[PDB]
Design a protein around this ligand. Structure first.
Ligand code: SF4
Ligand code: SF4
Ligand code: SF4
Ligand code: F
Ligand code: F
Ligand code: F
Ligand code: F
Ligand code: F
Ligand code: F
Ligand code: F
Ligand code: NA
Ligand code: NA
Ligand code: NA
Ligand code: NA
Ligand code: NA
Ligand code: NA
Lengths: 629, 630
């Protein structure tokens, strides 16, 4: 009865999937039928073998406490904590690999330093000397100091400069100032053990402390170091959606997250031997396509075409045109191994962090990265000989998209509206001014996943379209950004098409689209860098600005960690999918009310995007009045 | 027409008082839960993202076979198993992390001092720390820093104990499970269990084994060694156990939890003259300290403090109406205590910011002024004796004598009695190695683990231990299992004639030891590894070659899972008396109970009948003896 998507190409292939007789993520959601209301409310605990225990989400009725004595609030808050601990760890290991790659950069090696100016500037944040030193001794000293942020047991951690000092001392008084990344993950996992913490407030506060090691450390260093090694993103053109697949080219799709592999596949797709090889098997060339975050990472830096977002990964295989599906870690549906048994596609896993049964394991040798990517790519190009062009169905649907909007590039773009003799250059002042003046009502980040509980991409598009109509500039990352890209919002033409008067004027003056694709989900750290720069420039804290974050169709534990650190940093967050918290009323009051008194923001749970847009606008105008703007 | 709740007499008496007083127990809450969910009982339910919750069929080929993301039953089972190990590892991790921090803050005239210099000097040589002619506290700080790097170093290798055989290290390396930093492996396991990551049962379990190794050989190990350095290495010491140790006319302060620093500082505060006179002024005879669970073991091994009871007895202690102060830190403090303590004059005090409990009294243990903080907290217990009502008090006159303190150094010390002055070398484990190879001792078995309402409490412990020592298998015990043995009376030299077999009784008479050796808390299980490795190293073999076994007859916590996983990966067959949630994943069962043997030389055994378990252990040991030629 309900529509499965709002994207036509997504729907066309869904029909082919039914004809071919293959399962999709929608079909498995249906097979699940009415999902257990206990786990949907968070009032089930399995933290020890006395259980499984389930208490009633309706207070006063049914079973009240678990066998150990845990209340509903205790069970909910611990389950919520372990979600943050998981998402934190996901981004943690991500940035740890990126820092390790930076430690192994050499002058003549496969991994180099590409943005010397950024490294010199990042080195100043770690108190690493740069005057007259070799650029790789600097990079190694930066990597070492960044790695210390993951497991140091003595001393304090290094935090970015755009984090307002008001917020640091706020965290200190609240007792949520971050420690080492792995050290907090262990701390949350410790207190959630049976017979440890049994207080909702203290439990949530540990979760907020954990999430800070993600946004301002794990994800932040991951992004900063990814820019140093691969290049800081700048505005770039690309095409999005499943129509980027070419029938007469070798289609290699990069799925996953960790960017070192996809960065090396891009460089491997230009080796004359591998270029000549694709021609020898009968194709026109090598057509690199990205999906999800590793697709975002290479599109921001190299404009590689974005094949699609989370709930489309199954449908790319259904086209019958994917010769290689090269995946690393995070958000690779294990169903792909069974699905690709019905097609010539070679589904190749590469990271020992994410083995998948019945896939083809080709370990990405991080000690010979380029040679290793070539070996994996050659296997994909050879697989082109096994394509059956009669069963191929590539929908004729693709949209142009502009992305590459890093903080540096937004600042660079804003310099255009600065009078040579008046203001300062290379600052975020132009954006602060249009916010203070009121031409822009606010700025909203729209991030998040896809989720079968929501018509895929429908909540993203309605939220984004509604915010830009009310003169709220919108920045996007991850699968939401790729949902904007497919729809056609990442175009300068989208301003007069969909934006209100103020946003349309700023868009024309700055020469930008109304929706800024700021990269992958570790790249959300760019959003914090941006908002923090505006707060510092206006002498205020981040809870005082008219900013907001939205997760219209989230799913991953990464999103819970992301949403939790966005709030603790001081930014109101709207969720479009109810988290499993309804069972514990104290947990609800903490996340949706008391949070305000702690950090200056709170969570909002709204499944109607049009309602959420109202709330965001009203909350912004409320905060605007408090600030006098 | 129901099963008994316990085999302990004092436990049954107070349970009748709890019913009479109108309060609820952990047994009562178990009955309220009724039929627990078969899905979560089989481990075929996932909640690792909001696409779910999903539940797949535990019977393969029937029902819903895959979750929304495509995860099979084996994937879901294997990931849920991994997160148990990660949590159990994290608990012992932070336990030893905090202890190492105390070692870093030791000082000449401070509250925390170095007490076993000879242990500290020997540990420093294990961490490549110079000791010749250096101040003793410069050494302690260097050793602490080296131990803290084991938790979060990102480059280089980790420091491991010398009693770990190189054959086992080389085995782990080829298998791909050589441990990294403690907090790092915890994060790595949490990463791969995220949605859309690892989806292969073998790779997932192998990640669990690599993670658990950072507990037994690092987390728990460093915690135990550093606890001995600061508080003293345990030696043969007498004590009394069970709930009767409470004195009606004295101040009863009960220490519950795991972290030893608070319990240690309260012991030293219980001898402050100002507080003793206050105890007499409020109308009491003296300060009666009683411990529970690990923190009760930690102070009983070192100071002979009386042991109040094990895990499922903690509620019944408050039911006696004689607990004036209940001081708890972290790990295994049932949140029901906060509600139970409201029906009695007991003040339920939480002390650690790691484990706040609602509607309790929070007195944050100041580690910068430890003794003054312990003094301050103890005074609140003494003053609460004025609210005692002696008409309701019912302390069952039941308690048994017990011997403990059997650290590795003390066991080696006791083995010297049977060494000839001219023949063999002193201060080695050779006497224990010789009786095993000869066959006088058929094997060595470690009985550890929790309590669990699914088993008649302490019955699986006592039946397991009694059957083993009857079959000439010496039994070492830690944690609540040890306290089960202390309550029943197995921690006595008189227990040899009563229950031991011929060979074991002969070894007990010669060495002058009980047939059951209490080796401390559950981080003190590292002492058991340290012992077995010395025997493995002295016989030129690996640990999977020795006739050794581990048993957790009534386990419950995720700490036990991580414990049982590192015991197996170390090369010691482990029997489990409570079935873990793995029955829904047939590949996971094959990995844990068969394939594991071909990886690390040991495997899990799931058996709820302790008599059948003893049969399996004895037959298994004989196979490894015949394989080894002994
Ligand atoms: S922590 Fe408590 S409520 Fe949760 S499963 Fe364990 S015994 Fe039950
Ligand atoms: S969430 Fe709990 S009650 Fe629901 S199916 Fe899973 S184990 Fe059962
Ligand atoms: S990870 Fe898979 S099995 Fe688990 S809740 Fe998500 S879709 Fe379901
Ligand atoms: F095909
Ligand atoms: F790893
Ligand atoms: F159910
Ligand atoms: F493996
Ligand atoms: F009382
Ligand atoms: F000693
Ligand atoms: F074997
Ligand atoms: Na920066
Ligand atoms: Na195939
Ligand atoms: Na309020
Ligand atoms: Na030692
Ligand atoms: Na076999
Ligand atoms: Na059975």
């Amino acid at each position: 009865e309900k529509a499965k998507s709002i994207d036509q190409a997504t729907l066309q292939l869904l029909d082919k999937a039914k004809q071919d007789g293959v399962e999709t993520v929608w079909d498995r959601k249906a097979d699940m039928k009415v999902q257990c209301g206990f786990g949907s409310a968070g009032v089930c605990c399995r933290n020890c073998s006395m259980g499984p225990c389930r208490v009633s989400p309706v207070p006063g009725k049914g079973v009240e406490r678990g066998i150990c004595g845990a209340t509903a609030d205790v069970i909910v808050s611990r389950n919520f904590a372990r979600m943050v601990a998981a998402g934190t760890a996901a981004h943690s290991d991500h940035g740890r690999s990126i820092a390790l790659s930076l430690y192994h950069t050499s002058k003549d090696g496969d991994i180099k330093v590409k943005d010397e100016n950024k490294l010199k500037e990042v080195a100043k944040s770690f108190n690493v000397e740069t005057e007259g030193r070799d650029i790789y001794d600097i990079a190694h000293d930066v990597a070492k100091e960044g790695l210390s942020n993951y497991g140091k047991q003595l001393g304090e951690v290094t935090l970015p400069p755009s984090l307002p000092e008001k917020r640091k001392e706020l965290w200190r008084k609240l007792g949520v100032y971050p420690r080492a990344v792995d050290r907090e993950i262990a701390a949350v996992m410790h207190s959630t053990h049976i017979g440890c913490n049994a207080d909702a407030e203290a439990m949530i506060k540990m979760s907020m402390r954990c999430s800070l090691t993600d946004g301002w450390m794990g994800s932040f260093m991951g992004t900063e170091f990814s820019d140093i090694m691969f290049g800081t993103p700048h505005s770039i053109d690309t095409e999005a959606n499943l129509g980027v697949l070419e029938k007469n080219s070798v289609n290699v799709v990069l799925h996953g997250h960790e960017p070192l592999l996809s960065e090396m596949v891009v460089e491997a797709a230009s080796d004359p031997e591998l270029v000549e090889l694709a021609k020898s098997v009968g194709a026109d060339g090598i057509n690199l396509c990205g999906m999800c975050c590793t697709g975002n990472e290479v599109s921001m830096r190299h404009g590689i075409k974005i094949a699609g977002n989370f709930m489309q990964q199954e449908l790319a295989v259904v086209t019958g045109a994917v010769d290689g599906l090269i995946v690393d870690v995070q958000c690779i549906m294990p169903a792909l191994a069974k699905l690709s048994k019905s097609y010539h596609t070679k589904f190749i896993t590469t990271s020992p962090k994410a083995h998948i049964t019945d896939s083809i394991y080709m370990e990405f040798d991080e000690e010979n990265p380029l040679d290793s990517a070539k070996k994996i790519l050659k296997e994909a190009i050879l697989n082109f000989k096994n394509r059956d062009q009669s069963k191929v169905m590539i929908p004729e649907l693709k949209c142009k998209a502009i992305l590459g909007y890093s903080v540096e590039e937004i600042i660079n773009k804003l310099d255009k509206v600065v009078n040579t003799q008046i203001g300062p250059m290379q600052t975020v002042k132009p954006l602060a001014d249009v916010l203070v003046s009121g031409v822009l009502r606010g700025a909203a980040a729209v991030v998040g996943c896809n989720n079968p509980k929501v018509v895929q991409d429908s909540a993203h598009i309605e939220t984004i379209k509604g915010l830009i109509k009310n003169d709220v500039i919108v920045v996007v990352t991850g699968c939401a950004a790729q949902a904007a890209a497919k729809y056609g919002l990442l175009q300068k033409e989208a301003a007069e098409k969909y934006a209100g008067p103020g946003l349309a004027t700023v868009c024309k003056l700055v020469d930008i689209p109304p929706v800024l694709h700021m990269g992958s989900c570790v790249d959300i750290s760019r959003i914090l860098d941006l908002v923090g720069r505006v707060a510092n420039l206006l002498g205020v804290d981040m809870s005082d600005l008219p900013v907001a974050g939205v997760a219209p169709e989230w799913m991953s534990e990464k999103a819970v960690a992301i949403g939790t650190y966005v709030v603790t940093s001081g930014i109101d967050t709207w969720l479009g999918v109810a988290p499993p918290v309804t069972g514990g009323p104290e947990v609800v009051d903490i996340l949706t009310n008391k949070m305000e008194d702690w950090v200056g923001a709170k969570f909002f749970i709204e499944t109607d995007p049009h309602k959420a847009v109202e709330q965001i606008v009203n909350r912004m105008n409320e905060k605007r009045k408090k600030l006098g703007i």
